[PDB]
Design a protein around this ligand. Sequence first.
Ligand SMILES: *C(=O)CCSC(=O)CC[S-]
Ligand SMILES: *C(=O)CCSC(=O)CC[S-]
Ligand SMILES: [Zn+2]
Ligand SMILES: [Zn+2]
Ligand SMILES: [Zn+2]
Ligand SMILES: [Zn+2]
Lengths: 217, 218
Amino acid sequence: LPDLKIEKLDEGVYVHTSFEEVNGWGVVPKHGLVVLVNAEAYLIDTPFTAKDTEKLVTWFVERGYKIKGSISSHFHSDSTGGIEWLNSRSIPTYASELTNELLKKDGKVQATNSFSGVNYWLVKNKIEVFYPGPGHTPDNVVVWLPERKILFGGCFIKPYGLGNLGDANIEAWPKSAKLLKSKYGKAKLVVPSHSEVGDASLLKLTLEQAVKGLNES
Amino acid sequence: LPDLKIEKLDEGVYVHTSFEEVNGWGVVPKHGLVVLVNAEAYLIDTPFTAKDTEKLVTWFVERGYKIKGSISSHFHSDSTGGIEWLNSRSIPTYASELTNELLKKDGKVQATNSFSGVNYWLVKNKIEVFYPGPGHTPDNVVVWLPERKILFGGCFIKPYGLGNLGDANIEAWPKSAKLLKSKYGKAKLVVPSHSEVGDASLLKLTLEQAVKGLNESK
Ligand SMILES: *C(=O)CCSC(=O)CC[S-]
Ligand SMILES: *C(=O)CCSC(=O)CC[S-]
Ligand SMILES: [Zn+2]
Ligand SMILES: [Zn+2]
Ligand SMILES: [Zn+2]
Ligand SMILES: [Zn+2]
Protein backbone atom coordinates (compact mmCIF):
# COMPACT_ATOMS: atom_id res chain seq x y z
CA LEU A 1 0.00 0.00 0.00
CA PRO A 2 2.79 2.50 0.92
CA ASP A 3 3.74 4.89 -1.90
CA LEU A 4 6.77 4.47 -4.13
CA LYS A 5 9.93 5.94 -2.61
CA ILE A 6 12.96 7.41 -4.34
CA GLU A 7 15.98 8.06 -2.16
CA LYS A 8 19.41 9.15 -3.40
CA LEU A 9 21.97 6.48 -2.49
CA ASP A 10 25.18 7.95 -3.90
CA GLU A 11 26.23 10.20 -6.78
CA GLY A 12 24.25 9.14 -9.82
CA VAL A 13 22.60 6.27 -7.95
CA TYR A 14 19.05 6.16 -6.60
CA VAL A 15 17.10 3.49 -4.75
CA HIS A 16 13.43 3.12 -5.62
CA THR A 17 11.11 1.25 -3.28
CA SER A 18 7.67 -0.09 -4.16
CA PHE A 19 5.40 -2.23 -2.00
CA GLU A 20 3.07 -5.11 -2.78
CA GLU A 21 1.14 -7.99 -1.21
CA VAL A 22 2.97 -11.32 -1.58
CA ASN A 23 1.33 -14.69 -0.87
CA GLY A 24 2.52 -15.68 2.58
CA TRP A 25 4.90 -12.78 3.17
CA GLY A 26 2.35 -10.00 3.59
CA VAL A 27 3.23 -6.51 2.40
CA VAL A 28 6.80 -6.70 1.10
CA PRO A 29 8.95 -3.72 0.00
CA LYS A 30 11.02 -4.03 -3.18
CA HIS A 31 14.23 -2.12 -3.83
CA GLY A 32 15.61 -1.34 -7.26
CA LEU A 33 17.92 1.34 -8.61
CA VAL A 34 18.00 4.15 -11.13
CA VAL A 35 21.49 4.74 -12.48
CA LEU A 36 22.40 8.13 -13.91
CA VAL A 37 24.72 8.19 -16.91
CA ASN A 38 25.27 11.70 -18.29
CA ALA A 39 21.80 13.30 -18.25
CA GLU A 40 20.39 9.86 -19.03
CA ALA A 41 19.03 7.28 -16.60
CA TYR A 42 18.62 3.52 -16.37
CA LEU A 43 16.19 1.46 -14.31
CA ILE A 44 17.57 -1.52 -12.44
CA ASP A 45 14.41 -3.58 -11.92
CA THR A 46 10.89 -2.21 -12.37
CA PRO A 47 8.47 -1.54 -9.51
CA PHE A 48 5.78 -4.22 -9.08
CA THR A 49 3.21 -2.20 -11.01
CA ALA A 50 3.01 -0.23 -14.22
CA LYS A 51 1.74 2.78 -12.26
CA ASP A 52 4.78 2.97 -10.00
CA THR A 53 6.95 2.29 -13.05
CA GLU A 54 5.53 5.40 -14.73
CA LYS A 55 5.73 7.52 -11.57
CA LEU A 56 9.40 6.55 -11.39
CA VAL A 57 10.05 7.29 -15.06
CA THR A 58 8.17 10.58 -14.75
CA TRP A 59 10.01 11.57 -11.57
CA PHE A 60 13.34 11.30 -13.38
CA VAL A 61 12.16 12.91 -16.62
CA GLU A 62 11.14 15.96 -14.59
CA ARG A 63 14.64 16.08 -13.10
CA GLY A 64 16.23 16.28 -16.54
CA TYR A 65 17.01 12.60 -17.08
CA LYS A 66 15.85 10.71 -20.16
CA ILE A 67 15.15 7.02 -19.51
CA LYS A 68 17.61 5.25 -21.83
CA GLY A 69 16.76 1.71 -20.77
CA SER A 70 15.58 -0.76 -18.13
CA ILE A 71 17.12 -4.02 -16.88
CA SER A 72 15.39 -6.77 -14.86
CA SER A 73 17.45 -9.00 -12.53
CA HIS A 74 15.08 -11.99 -12.64
CA PHE A 75 11.63 -12.99 -13.94
CA HIS A 76 9.51 -12.56 -10.79
CA SER A 77 6.94 -9.78 -11.19
CA ASP A 78 8.72 -7.60 -8.64
CA SER A 79 11.51 -6.99 -11.17
CA THR A 80 9.52 -7.20 -14.41
CA GLY A 81 6.15 -5.72 -13.47
CA GLY A 82 6.56 -2.61 -15.59
CA ILE A 83 7.94 -4.14 -18.80
CA GLU A 84 4.64 -4.04 -20.69
CA TRP A 85 4.27 -0.35 -19.93
CA LEU A 86 7.90 0.44 -20.74
CA ASN A 87 7.79 -1.36 -24.09
CA SER A 88 4.55 0.45 -24.97
CA ARG A 89 6.51 3.69 -24.55
CA SER A 90 9.32 2.38 -26.75
CA ILE A 91 11.80 2.37 -23.86
CA PRO A 92 14.54 -0.28 -24.32
CA THR A 93 14.06 -3.18 -21.90
CA TYR A 94 16.60 -5.92 -21.09
CA ALA A 95 16.57 -9.35 -19.43
CA SER A 96 18.77 -12.45 -19.66
CA GLU A 97 17.73 -15.10 -22.17
CA LEU A 98 16.85 -17.42 -19.28
CA THR A 99 14.65 -14.68 -17.83
CA ASN A 100 12.70 -14.09 -21.05
CA GLU A 101 12.18 -17.83 -21.46
CA LEU A 102 10.73 -18.01 -17.95
CA LEU A 103 8.63 -14.89 -18.60
CA LYS A 104 7.28 -16.50 -21.75
CA LYS A 105 6.66 -19.72 -19.84
CA ASP A 106 4.47 -17.91 -17.31
CA GLY A 107 2.50 -15.85 -19.83
CA LYS A 108 4.31 -12.57 -19.15
CA VAL A 109 5.53 -9.82 -21.47
CA GLN A 110 9.23 -10.23 -22.27
CA ALA A 111 12.06 -7.72 -22.36
CA THR A 112 12.83 -6.46 -25.86
CA ASN A 113 16.56 -7.17 -25.62
CA SER A 114 18.14 -10.31 -24.18
CA PHE A 115 21.67 -11.38 -23.28
CA SER A 116 23.46 -14.37 -21.76
CA GLY A 117 26.78 -15.58 -20.41
CA VAL A 118 28.82 -14.68 -17.34
CA ASN A 119 29.31 -10.96 -17.92
CA TYR A 120 27.51 -8.37 -20.02
CA TRP A 121 27.89 -4.60 -20.20
CA LEU A 122 24.59 -2.75 -20.27
CA VAL A 123 26.78 0.36 -20.40
CA LYS A 124 30.55 0.08 -20.87
CA ASN A 125 32.52 0.74 -17.68
CA LYS A 126 29.41 1.99 -15.89
CA ILE A 127 26.79 -0.76 -15.68
CA GLU A 128 27.88 -4.40 -15.72
CA VAL A 129 25.65 -7.45 -15.29
CA PHE A 130 26.90 -10.63 -13.62
CA TYR A 131 25.38 -14.13 -13.52
CA PRO A 132 26.54 -16.06 -10.40
CA GLY A 133 24.49 -19.13 -11.27
CA PRO A 134 21.09 -20.45 -10.06
CA GLY A 135 19.98 -19.51 -6.55
CA HIS A 136 16.83 -17.58 -5.69
CA THR A 137 15.76 -18.36 -9.26
CA PRO A 138 17.37 -20.17 -12.23
CA ASP A 139 17.90 -16.85 -14.02
CA ASN A 140 18.88 -14.34 -11.33
CA VAL A 141 21.65 -11.90 -12.25
CA VAL A 142 23.21 -9.00 -10.36
CA VAL A 143 24.24 -5.52 -11.44
CA TRP A 144 27.64 -3.97 -10.70
CA LEU A 145 28.50 -0.26 -10.80
CA PRO A 146 32.33 -0.01 -11.13
CA GLU A 147 32.52 3.75 -10.51
CA ARG A 148 30.64 3.79 -7.20
CA LYS A 149 31.66 0.30 -6.09
CA ILE A 150 27.97 -0.54 -5.69
CA LEU A 151 26.38 -3.95 -6.29
CA PHE A 152 22.69 -4.57 -6.79
CA GLY A 153 22.08 -8.09 -5.51
CA GLY A 154 18.38 -8.19 -6.30
CA CYS A 155 16.53 -11.13 -4.81
CA PHE A 156 19.66 -13.30 -4.77
CA ILE A 157 20.89 -11.54 -1.63
CA LYS A 158 18.91 -13.17 1.19
CA PRO A 159 20.96 -12.42 4.39
CA TYR A 160 18.34 -13.42 6.98
CA GLY A 161 16.38 -16.15 5.23
CA LEU A 162 16.05 -17.62 1.75
CA GLY A 163 12.46 -16.38 1.48
CA ASN A 164 10.34 -17.51 -1.48
CA LEU A 165 11.72 -20.91 -2.54
CA GLY A 166 9.09 -21.43 -5.22
CA ASP A 167 11.68 -21.31 -8.00
CA ALA A 168 14.91 -21.61 -6.00
CA ASN A 169 17.74 -24.02 -6.84
CA ILE A 170 18.80 -24.82 -3.28
CA GLU A 171 21.43 -27.31 -4.46
CA ALA A 172 23.28 -24.70 -6.51
CA TRP A 173 22.60 -21.59 -4.40
CA PRO A 174 25.60 -22.08 -2.09
CA LYS A 175 28.01 -22.56 -5.01
CA SER A 176 26.59 -19.45 -6.71
CA ALA A 177 26.85 -17.37 -3.53
CA LYS A 178 30.47 -18.43 -3.09
CA LEU A 179 31.21 -17.23 -6.61
CA LEU A 180 29.46 -13.90 -6.09
CA LYS A 181 31.23 -13.24 -2.79
CA SER A 182 34.75 -13.76 -4.12
CA LYS A 183 33.98 -11.64 -7.19
CA TYR A 184 32.50 -8.61 -5.43
CA GLY A 185 34.06 -8.59 -1.97
CA LYS A 186 35.46 -5.25 -3.09
CA ALA A 187 31.92 -3.84 -2.97
CA LYS A 188 31.45 -0.68 -0.93
CA LEU A 189 27.67 -1.20 -0.88
CA VAL A 190 25.32 -4.11 -1.53
CA VAL A 191 21.66 -3.39 -2.27
CA PRO A 192 19.19 -6.25 -1.64
CA SER A 193 15.69 -6.36 -3.11
CA HIS A 194 14.01 -7.10 0.22
CA SER A 195 16.49 -6.03 2.90
CA GLU A 196 18.07 -2.69 3.78
CA VAL A 197 21.40 -1.63 2.26
CA GLY A 198 24.69 -2.85 3.68
CA ASP A 199 28.29 -3.72 2.80
CA ALA A 200 30.26 -6.71 1.49
CA SER A 201 29.23 -8.65 4.60
CA LEU A 202 25.77 -9.20 3.10
CA LEU A 203 27.58 -11.51 0.69
CA LYS A 204 28.82 -13.68 3.55
CA LEU A 205 25.40 -13.76 5.23
CA THR A 206 23.80 -14.87 1.97
CA LEU A 207 26.34 -17.67 1.56
CA GLU A 208 25.59 -18.93 5.08
CA GLN A 209 21.81 -18.91 4.56
CA ALA A 210 22.21 -20.87 1.30
CA VAL A 211 24.54 -23.42 2.86
CA LYS A 212 22.18 -23.62 5.86
CA GLY A 213 19.34 -23.92 3.31
CA LEU A 214 20.80 -27.01 1.60
CA ASN A 215 21.82 -28.76 4.86
CA GLU A 216 18.30 -27.95 6.08
CA SER A 217 16.90 -29.94 3.15
CA LEU B 1 9.39 -15.06 11.21
CA PRO B 2 13.14 -15.78 11.50
CA ASP B 3 14.04 -17.24 14.90
CA LEU B 4 16.06 -15.44 17.57
CA LYS B 5 19.80 -16.12 17.36
CA ILE B 6 22.65 -15.53 19.81
CA GLU B 7 26.12 -15.33 18.26
CA LYS B 8 29.30 -14.80 20.27
CA LEU B 9 30.79 -11.48 19.18
CA ASP B 10 33.77 -11.48 21.51
CA GLU B 11 34.74 -12.88 24.90
CA GLY B 12 32.00 -12.23 27.43
CA VAL B 13 30.14 -10.39 24.67
CA TYR B 14 27.29 -11.81 22.60
CA VAL B 15 25.01 -10.38 19.92
CA HIS B 16 21.31 -11.23 20.11
CA THR B 17 19.25 -10.84 16.95
CA SER B 18 15.46 -10.69 16.83
CA PHE B 19 13.13 -9.89 13.93
CA GLU B 20 9.75 -8.28 13.38
CA GLU B 21 7.55 -6.67 10.75
CA VAL B 22 7.63 -2.87 10.58
CA ASN B 23 5.20 -1.01 8.33
CA GLY B 24 7.25 0.42 5.48
CA TRP B 25 10.45 -1.51 6.15
CA GLY B 26 9.45 -5.17 5.94
CA VAL B 27 11.00 -7.85 8.17
CA VAL B 28 13.53 -5.85 10.18
CA PRO B 29 16.49 -7.51 11.95
CA LYS B 30 17.40 -6.12 15.38
CA HIS B 31 20.77 -6.46 17.10
CA GLY B 32 21.39 -6.12 20.81
CA LEU B 33 24.16 -7.22 23.14
CA VAL B 34 24.61 -9.36 26.22
CA VAL B 35 27.63 -8.45 28.32
CA LEU B 36 29.00 -10.96 30.83
CA VAL B 37 30.28 -10.04 34.30
CA ASN B 38 31.33 -12.92 36.59
CA ALA B 39 28.65 -15.55 35.93
CA GLU B 40 26.30 -12.56 35.63
CA ALA B 41 25.01 -10.85 32.50
CA TYR B 42 23.58 -7.50 31.43
CA LEU B 43 21.12 -6.99 28.61
CA ILE B 44 21.85 -4.22 26.13
CA ASP B 45 18.45 -3.57 24.53
CA THR B 46 15.61 -6.10 24.53
CA PRO B 47 14.01 -8.12 21.69
CA PHE B 48 10.68 -6.86 20.31
CA THR B 49 8.65 -9.37 22.33
CA ALA B 50 8.36 -10.77 25.84
CA LYS B 51 8.74 -14.28 24.40
CA ASP B 52 12.05 -13.61 22.64
CA THR B 53 13.19 -11.84 25.80
CA GLU B 54 12.32 -14.98 27.76
CA LYS B 55 14.21 -17.28 25.38
CA LEU B 56 17.17 -14.90 25.56
CA VAL B 57 17.24 -14.68 29.35
CA THR B 58 16.92 -18.47 29.56
CA TRP B 59 19.67 -19.33 27.06
CA PHE B 60 22.05 -17.56 29.43
CA VAL B 61 20.69 -18.67 32.80
CA GLU B 62 20.69 -22.11 31.20
CA ARG B 63 24.42 -21.56 30.67
CA GLY B 64 24.99 -20.62 34.31
CA TYR B 65 24.59 -16.84 34.35
CA LYS B 66 22.54 -14.52 36.56
CA ILE B 67 20.64 -11.67 34.90
CA LYS B 68 21.88 -8.67 36.89
CA GLY B 69 20.11 -5.99 34.85
CA SER B 70 18.99 -4.64 31.47
CA ILE B 71 19.41 -1.35 29.59
CA SER B 72 17.50 0.04 26.59
CA SER B 73 19.12 2.48 24.10
CA HIS B 74 15.85 4.29 23.27
CA PHE B 75 12.07 3.96 23.66
CA HIS B 76 11.08 2.31 20.34
CA SER B 77 9.84 -1.21 21.10
CA ASP B 78 12.80 -2.86 19.38
CA SER B 79 14.73 -1.79 22.51
CA THR B 80 12.04 -1.82 25.22
CA GLY B 81 9.80 -4.61 23.96
CA GLY B 82 10.61 -6.84 26.91
CA ILE B 83 10.69 -4.35 29.78
CA GLU B 84 7.25 -5.46 30.95
CA TRP B 85 8.43 -9.06 31.23
CA LEU B 86 11.79 -8.20 32.76
CA ASN B 87 10.01 -6.18 35.45
CA SER B 88 7.42 -8.91 36.02
CA ARG B 89 10.24 -11.41 36.57
CA SER B 90 11.82 -8.85 38.89
CA ILE B 91 14.90 -8.04 36.82
CA PRO B 92 16.66 -4.61 37.07
CA THR B 93 15.72 -2.51 34.04
CA TYR B 94 17.37 0.80 33.16
CA ALA B 95 16.31 3.48 30.69
CA SER B 96 17.29 7.15 30.41
CA GLU B 97 15.19 9.78 32.17
CA LEU B 98 14.03 11.03 28.76
CA THR B 99 13.35 7.47 27.65
CA ASN B 100 11.13 6.63 30.61
CA GLU B 101 9.37 9.96 30.10
CA LEU B 102 8.62 9.07 26.47
CA LEU B 103 7.56 5.55 27.43
CA LYS B 104 5.19 7.11 29.95
CA LYS B 105 3.81 9.50 27.33
CA ASP B 106 3.21 6.57 24.96
CA GLY B 107 1.42 4.53 27.61
CA LYS B 108 4.18 1.95 27.90
CA VAL B 109 5.64 0.19 30.94
CA GLN B 110 8.74 2.11 32.04
CA ALA B 111 12.09 0.82 33.28
CA THR B 112 12.44 0.47 37.05
CA ASN B 113 15.64 2.54 37.14
CA SER B 114 16.37 5.79 35.31
CA PHE B 115 19.39 8.09 34.97
CA SER B 116 20.30 11.35 33.27
CA GLY B 117 23.26 13.36 32.06
CA VAL B 118 25.94 12.85 29.43
CA ASN B 119 27.75 9.91 31.06
CA TYR B 120 26.45 7.17 33.35
CA TRP B 121 28.19 3.96 34.43
CA LEU B 122 25.79 1.01 34.58
CA VAL B 123 28.88 -0.84 35.81
CA LYS B 124 31.95 1.20 36.75
CA ASN B 125 35.14 0.42 34.83
CA LYS B 126 33.11 -1.95 32.64
CA ILE B 127 29.82 -0.64 31.21
CA GLU B 128 29.23 3.00 30.28
CA VAL B 129 26.24 4.81 28.78
CA PHE B 130 26.67 7.99 26.73
CA TYR B 131 24.16 10.52 25.37
CA PRO B 132 25.33 12.24 22.14
CA GLY B 133 22.16 14.31 21.90
CA PRO B 134 18.98 14.03 19.73
CA GLY B 135 19.22 12.00 16.53
CA HIS B 136 17.27 8.88 15.52
CA THR B 137 15.10 9.81 18.52
CA PRO B 138 15.25 12.59 21.17
CA ASP B 139 16.50 10.08 23.74
CA ASN B 140 18.87 7.68 21.96
CA VAL B 141 22.04 6.92 23.90
CA VAL B 142 24.90 4.51 23.17
CA VAL B 143 26.79 1.92 25.19
CA TRP B 144 30.57 1.68 25.47
CA LEU B 145 32.48 -1.39 26.64
CA PRO B 146 35.92 -0.01 27.72
CA GLU B 147 37.37 -3.45 28.40
CA ARG B 148 36.77 -4.45 24.77
CA LYS B 149 36.75 -1.21 22.77
CA ILE B 150 33.28 -2.21 21.60
CA LEU B 151 30.55 0.39 21.16
CA PHE B 152 26.92 -0.59 20.77
CA GLY B 153 25.63 2.11 18.45
CA GLY B 154 21.94 1.29 18.65
CA CYS B 155 19.37 2.67 16.23
CA PHE B 156 21.33 5.93 16.20
CA ILE B 157 24.00 4.33 14.01
CA LYS B 158 22.45 4.45 10.53
CA PRO B 159 25.50 4.20 8.18
CA TYR B 160 23.62 3.51 4.91
CA GLY B 161 20.46 5.55 5.31
CA LEU B 162 18.68 7.15 8.25
CA GLY B 163 15.67 4.80 8.21
CA ASN B 164 12.38 5.42 10.02
CA LEU B 165 12.38 9.18 10.63
CA GLY B 166 9.12 9.23 12.56
CA ASP B 167 10.75 10.46 15.78
CA ALA B 168 14.03 11.71 14.35
CA ASN B 169 15.53 15.11 15.15
CA ILE B 170 17.11 15.87 11.76
CA GLU B 171 18.67 19.22 12.72
CA ALA B 172 20.33 17.87 15.88
CA TRP B 173 21.45 14.51 14.47
CA PRO B 174 24.48 15.83 12.55
CA LYS B 175 25.99 17.60 15.57
CA SER B 176 25.33 14.58 17.77
CA ALA B 177 27.05 12.34 15.22
CA LYS B 178 29.99 14.75 15.33
CA LEU B 179 30.16 14.55 19.11
CA LEU B 180 29.82 10.78 18.99
CA LYS B 181 32.48 10.43 16.29
CA SER B 182 35.21 12.13 18.31
CA LYS B 183 34.11 10.82 21.71
CA TYR B 184 34.41 7.21 20.50
CA GLY B 185 36.55 7.34 17.37
CA LYS B 186 38.75 4.83 19.19
CA ALA B 187 36.21 2.02 18.76
CA LYS B 188 37.38 -1.38 17.52
CA LEU B 189 33.82 -2.49 16.76
CA VAL B 190 30.64 -0.48 16.31
CA VAL B 191 27.43 -2.49 16.59
CA PRO B 192 24.37 -1.05 14.80
CA SER B 193 20.82 -2.08 15.67
CA HIS B 194 19.86 -2.68 12.04
CA SER B 195 23.14 -3.21 10.18
CA GLU B 196 26.04 -5.63 10.45
CA VAL B 197 28.91 -5.02 12.85
CA GLY B 198 31.86 -2.95 11.69
CA ASP B 199 34.47 -0.54 13.03
CA ALA B 200 34.89 3.18 13.77
CA SER B 201 34.26 3.90 10.09
CA LEU B 202 30.55 3.47 10.83
CA LEU B 203 30.73 6.60 12.98
CA LYS B 204 31.94 8.54 9.96
CA LEU B 205 29.26 7.03 7.72
CA THR B 206 26.48 7.92 10.17
CA LEU B 207 27.57 11.57 10.34
CA GLU B 208 27.60 11.79 6.55
CA GLN B 209 24.08 10.37 6.41
CA ALA B 210 22.81 12.79 9.06
CA VAL B 211 24.33 15.78 7.26
CA LYS B 212 22.89 14.51 3.97
CA GLY B 213 19.70 14.23 6.01
CA LEU B 214 19.53 17.83 7.11
CA ASN B 215 20.69 19.16 3.70
CA GLU B 216 18.29 16.83 2.02
CA SER B 217 15.55 18.19 4.30
CA LYS B 218 15.82 21.88 3.44
C1 LIG C 1 12.24 -13.33 -0.63
O1 LIG C 1 12.04 -14.05 -1.61
C2 LIG C 1 11.09 -12.82 0.23
C3 LIG C 1 9.73 -12.92 -0.44
S1 LIG C 1 9.41 -11.54 -1.59
C4 LIG C 1 8.90 -12.42 -3.01
O2 LIG C 1 8.68 -13.63 -2.94
C5 LIG C 1 8.71 -11.66 -4.33
C6 LIG C 1 9.48 -12.28 -5.50
S2 LIG C 1 11.27 -12.46 -5.18
C1 LIG D 1 15.90 2.15 10.95
O1 LIG D 1 15.16 2.90 11.60
C2 LIG D 1 15.33 0.99 10.15
C3 LIG D 1 13.89 0.67 10.50
S1 LIG D 1 13.71 -0.13 12.13
C4 LIG D 1 12.48 0.88 12.85
O2 LIG D 1 12.06 1.87 12.24
C5 LIG D 1 11.95 0.54 14.22
C6 LIG D 1 13.04 0.48 15.27
S2 LIG D 1 14.02 2.01 15.37
ZN1 LIG E 1 12.03 -13.41 -7.01
ZN1 LIG F 1 11.98 -10.27 -4.96
ZN1 LIG G 1 14.14 3.45 17.03
ZN1 LIG H 1 15.71 0.31 15.87
